[PDB]
C-alpha cells in the first residue's frame, strides 16, 4: 500500500480502527524534565497510550533520550514487550566525523540517539540479524531519528503493515500509516481501515 | 547513501566509515581542542598516584578492606553471558548485584559499569539502583570490522556490534557550581575501535581517559582489572593480578594532608574548558 496518514492527537485517536501491525515505531516528545521548544506528553499520558491494541505479535521501536532511557523501558514492559535490542544512531557531520565539541549532554557530550527494540508475542516471518545495531548518518531533517531505520525495519519484516506514532510529513512511507498532529489532513486507502474510520468518525 | 544497506551488501559495518576516531587523529587539525586535552592529561599526570594493585577473588573478598572512599569506580566483571555465548570466575548479574559497591563509593562519586549488549543493559541499571547511583550517561564502545568484514544471543534481532558502559552518579553534583569536582563535556559518550580478536577481553583504554578528564577526584578504583591494565592514578583489584603492592595506609596517605583528594585545576585549563 502507498503511504497513509491521519493528522490527529495520539492521546485521543481511537486507534482500534487501525487494525494490527507487525511493527510499531514511536519517537515521542518525552517529558525529559527540561525546558524545551516543543510540547511534551506527561509520563502518565505516555503510559496510557493504547499501544497494546496495535499489536499481538511483532516488534516495537521506541526512541528514547534522557530520563526516558528508564521511562521508555517501563513503557515497553507496561505495553507487553520484552526489550531484545538497542539500536543507536551515531550522528556524523558532512565529512563522516563525530562532532565532539559543544555542551550536548549534562555530563558527557552526546554522539548518538537510542532506540529500544521490543518483541511481543510470537512473530512469524521476520529476518533476524540482517542489519547491525549501529546506524551512522548525518542529521538531515527536523526529525531526531535517521531515515535508515525504515530500510532496516523493511528488511526485518518485508511487506507487512506498520504504524508510526508522532510522525511528521517527511516521514510518510509505503507500508506505513503515520500518525501525528502536523500531517496534512487524513489519507486512508486500505479498505478495512476506511470502513472502521467511517463507522467510528 | 545508506551505510545500513551497504552493510547488508558487503559486511562492512556502518561504523567502519566514521573518520578520525583515534585518540591522536581526532584533534590533529584542531590545535586548540588538542591543547585542552594535552593540558588536562598533564594535570592528571602531575597528580597521579603510582600504580597500585591487589590480587583478590572479588566474590569472596570483603570489599570494605579497600579504603579510602573512591571518587570513580570502573567495573569490568567477566560476564558469564560472554563465555557462554562464545565458548577466573564468570559472573551472572545476580553475582554482580551482590557486590557492596555502595560501601566503598564516596558520597559524591561516579561509576562506570561495563554491561555488554544484552540483558546487562537492563540488569546493570538495577545494579546501579542497588548501589545507590542514578544512570546518567551511556558510553557506547562501537566496534569496527575493517579487518574482517561480514556477519557475526538467540533473542537478538540485529547483529550486536557494540558494548555499553553505563555511567552512574551518586550524591549531589552541580556542573556550574562544582567545577572543582567535574569538567563536564570534555569527551563524547562514544568510543570507536576495531573488534578485538575472539578471546581478547580487554576494554578500550580510552575509557580511562574519559573518566580521568571528567572527574577531578584522584581516588580511582578499577575492579576486575589485570596486569595489562595497571595504570598510574588507579588502584587495580582483580583475581588474575600476579603481584600485589596495595597497602591501604599508604594508598590513603596519597590523598590526605598535605594532599587533596582532588586534582585541582590550572588557570589555563579553566579558561579553555567548556563552561556555561
Curated annotation (Swiss-Prot), chain A:
Q: How does it assemble?
A: Heterodimer; heterodimerizes with METTL14 to form an antiparallel heterodimer that constitutes an active methyltransferase. Component of the WMM complex, a N6-methyltransferase complex composed of a catalytic subcomplex, named MAC, and of an associated subcomplex, named MACOM. The MAC subcomplex is composed of METTL3 and METTL14. The MACOM subcomplex is composed of WTAP, ZC3H13, CBLL1/HAKAI, VIRMA, and, in some cases of RBM15 (RBM15 or RBM15B). Interacts with NCBP1/CBP80. Interacts with EIF4E. Interacts with EIF3B.
Q: Which residues bind S-adenosyl-L-methionine?
A: 9-10, 27, 145, 168-171, 181-182
The annotated consequence of residue 171 to A reads: Abolishes methyltransferase activity
- What would changing residue 109 to A do, according to UniProt? Decreased methyltransferase activity
Name of the featured protein:
N(6)-adenosine-methyltransferase catalytic subunit METTL3
Organism annotation? Homo sapiens (Human)
The impact of changing residue 182 to A is: Slight reduction in methyltransferase activity. Strong reduction in methyltransferase activity
Q: What is the effect of changing residue 27 to A?
A: Abolishes methyltransferase activity
Q: What is known of its domains?
A: Gate loop 1 and gate loop 2 regions are adjacent to the S-adenosyl-L-homocysteine-binding site and display large conformational changes upon ligand-binding. They may play an important role in adenosine recognition. The interface loop contributes to the heterodimer interaction.
PTM description: Sumoylation inhibits the N6-adenosine-methyltransferase activity. Sumoylation does not affect subcellular location or interaction with METTL14. Desumoylated by SENP1.
Q: List where in the cell it is found.
A: Nucleus; Nucleus speckle; Cytoplasm
What are the site positions for Interaction with METTL14?
70, 73
Q: Which domain of life is it from?
A: Eukaryota
Portion of the full sequence shown: 369 to 569 of 580
Swiss-Prot record, chain B:
Coiled-coil segments on the chain, per record: none
Q: Main localization of the protein?
A: nucleus
Q: Which UniProt keywords apply?
A: Differentiation, Nucleus, Phosphoprotein, RNA-binding, Spermatogenesis
* Top-level taxon of the source organism: Eukaryota
Residue segments, region Positively charged region required for RNA-binding: 125-134, 174-175
Please name the GO terms that the record assigns under molecular function.
mRNA binding; mRNA m(6)A methyltransferase activity
**Residues with the Phosphoserine modification:** 276
Substitution effect: residue 135 to E: Reduced RNA-binding
Any one cellular-component term (Gene Ontology) = nucleoplasm
- Per the UniProt entry, the disulfide pairs are none
List the residue(s) that the UniProt entry marks as the site Interaction with METTL3.
30, 122, 125, 175, 276
Described by its record, this protein's role is as follows: The METTL3-METTL14 heterodimer forms a N6-methyltransferase complex that methylates adenosine residues at the N(6) position of some mRNAs and regulates the circadian clock, differentiation of embryonic stem cells and cortical neurogenesis. In the heterodimer formed with METTL3, METTL14 constitutes the RNA-binding scaffold that recognizes the substrate rather than the catalytic core. N6-methyladenosine (m6A), which takes place at the 5'-[AG]GAC-3' consensus sites of some mRNAs, plays a role in mRNA stability and processing.
Mind telling me what this protein is named?
N(6)-adenosine-methyltransferase non-catalytic subunit METTL14
- Source organism of this protein record: Homo sapiens
Q: What portion of the full-length protein is represented by this chain?
A: 117 to 399 of 456
Amino acid at each position: 500500500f502507498p503511504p497513509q496518514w491521519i493528522c490527529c492527537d495520539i492521546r485521543y485517536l481511537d486507534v482500534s480502527i487501525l487494525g494490527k501491525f507487525a511493527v510499531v515505531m514511536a519517537d515521542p516528545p518525552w517529558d525529559i524534565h527540561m525546558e524545551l521548544p516543543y510540547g511534551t506528553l506527561t509520563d502518565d499520558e505516555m503510559r496510557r497510550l493504547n499501544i497494546p491494541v496495535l499489536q499481538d505479535d511483532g516488534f516495537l521501536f521506541l526512541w528514547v533520550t534522557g530520563r526516558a532511557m528508564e521511562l521508555g523501558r517501563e513503557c515497553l514492559n507496561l505495553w507487553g514487550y520484552e526489550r531484545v535490542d538497542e539500536i543507536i544512531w551515531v550522528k556524523t557531520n558532512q565529512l563522516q566525523r563525530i562532532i565532539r565539541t559543544g555542551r550536548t549532554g549534562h555530563w558527557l557530550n552526546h554522539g548518538k540517539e537510542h532506540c529500544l527494540v521490543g518483541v511481543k508475542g510470537n512473530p512469524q516471518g521476520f529476518n533476524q540479524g540482517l542489519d547491525c545495531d549501529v546506524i551512522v548518518a548525518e542529521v538531515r531533517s527536523t526529525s531526531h531519528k535517521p531515515d535508515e531505520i525504515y530500510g532496516m525495519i523493511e528488511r526485518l519484516s518485508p511487506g507487512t503493515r506498520k504504524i508510526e506514532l508522532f510522525g511528521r510529513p517527511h516521514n510518510v512511507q509505503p507500508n506505513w500509516i503515520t500518525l501525528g498532529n502536523q500531517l496534512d489532513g487524513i489519507h486512508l486507502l486500505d479498505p478495512d481501515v476506511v470502513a472502521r474510520f467511517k463507522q467510528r468518525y | 547513501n545508506d551505510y545500513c544497506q551497504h552493510f547488508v551488501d558487503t559486511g562492512h559495518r556502518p561504523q567502519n566509515f566514521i573518520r578520525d576516531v583515534g585518540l591522536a587523529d581526532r584533534f590533529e587539525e584542531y590545535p586548540k581542542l588538542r591543547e585542552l586535552i594535552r593540558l588536562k592529561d598533564e594535570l592528571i599526570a602531575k597528580s597521579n598516584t603510582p600504580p597500585m594493585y591487589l590480587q583478590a577473588d572479588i566474590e569472596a573478598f570483603d570489599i570494605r578492606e579497600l579504603t579510602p572512599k573512591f571518587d570513580v569506580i570502573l567495573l569490568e566483571p567477566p560476564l558469564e553471558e560472554y563465555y557462554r555465548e562464545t565458548g577466573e570466575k564468570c559472573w551472572t548479574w545476580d553475582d554482580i548485584m551482590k557486590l557492596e559497591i555502595d560501601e566503598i563509593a564516596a558520597p559524591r562519586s561516579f561509576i562506570f559499569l561495563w554491561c555488554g549488549s544484552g540483558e546487562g543493559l537492563d540488569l546493570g541499571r538495577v545494579c546501579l539502583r542497588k548501589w545507590g547511583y542514578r544512570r546518567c550517561e551511556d558510553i557506547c564502545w562501537i566496534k569496527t570490522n575493517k579487518n574482517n568484514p561480514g556477519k557475526t544471543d538467540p533473542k537478538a534481532v540485529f547483529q550486536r556490534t557494540k558494548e555499553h558502559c553505563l555511567m552512574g552518579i551518586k550524591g549531589t553534583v552541580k556542573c556550574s557550581t562544582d567545577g572543582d569536582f567535574i569538567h563536564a563535556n570534555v569527551d563524547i559518550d562514544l568510543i570507536i575501535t576495531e573488534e578485538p580478536e575472539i578471546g581478547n577481553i580487554e576494554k578500550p583504554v580510552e575509557i580511562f581517559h574519559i573518566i580521568e578528564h571528567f572527574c577531578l577526584g584522584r581516588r580511582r578504583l578499577h575492579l576486575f582489572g589485570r596486569d595489562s591494565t595497571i595504570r598510574p592514578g588507579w588502584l587495580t583489584v582483580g583475581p588474575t593480578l600476579t603481584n600485589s603492592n596495595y597497602n591501604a595506609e599508604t594508598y590513603a596517605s596519597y590523598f590526605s594532608a598535605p594532599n587533596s583528594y582532588l586534582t585541582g585545576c590550572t588557570e589555563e585549563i579553566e579558561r579553555l574548558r567548556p563552561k556555561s
